[PDB]
Amino acid sequence: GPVWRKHYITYRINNYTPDMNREDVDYAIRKAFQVWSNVTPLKFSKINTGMADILVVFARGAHGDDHAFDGKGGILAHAFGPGSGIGGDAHFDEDEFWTTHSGGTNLFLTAVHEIGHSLGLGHSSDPKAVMFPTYKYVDINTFRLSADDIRGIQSLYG
Template structure:
């Protein structure tokens, strides 16, 4: 490829890189999946402590109630509204909370995920959110049941999702993904990382192209030099 064409190609890639970086949103914005997911207050919550796995502890329900209180009394301060909850006994509630023995085994989620929240969104509002919590996980080869404090933290985190919050990059924030890695429910994360992935691919292409082209170029130069010196082409 002629040098001026190569230069134009490189310039085009640099321009694309610039655009990709320009359109990637700032990293430090606190992720909010939905700033106002619930239309009416209070939000009804059904805690299913009837269909329970073998290692369910009766104290878990109390931990979920405490996690709800955490958010209704201000939570991490990152919500733009104060939620009110009403615990109901019908399973057609706004938020449904249930337990399974092990998420990896019972719901096919990746290893290390302790809970997940699955929001059903209609016209920008949450119609319903299902929260599934596991009661324990494997640590090495042995299965360990979660203690109450652990269950409370997992519940707080998942309820945070049900209230419209995404993951935090702050390790001390309850929305930091320590207990679950259910990143695939977070559309913001994809938006944020996609331009970076594209930029990475373009940069890789540019490097390969540049070095590849440079190498070809220098080989031709060497061949010409050899021709001059030895009077004939090497091959």
């Protein structure tokens, strides 16, 4: 699929979830981007004005992208592939309970995952891969991209 044709990519939080406080949201997202720039020559920059490559949104139900969320459970989030406009944007189902750790849907892991799609990643068949299609809470202390995650992302960006 198309990949971002630039290594300097900006993102912007459009709106905040009420489940976590702001600094926890900011932290999760930022950390989430760091997971991917840690193993690539990509470099992420949060902006607070103007238009970003990747727009992080919290929303419930139908939110204007023709892919409605489904309330609590089922679909947690989706993200659009690299592109202009909605391209690369990552949306989070506000009807999930977003958390810094467990007792909800962990924002950090979920954003590491969506961000991966936002960069043009597919899914993996390794259950230890962050791009694995099934969500499960894993230990963030021992969090690590799998080989499969590393091979895929560096095949798009080096």
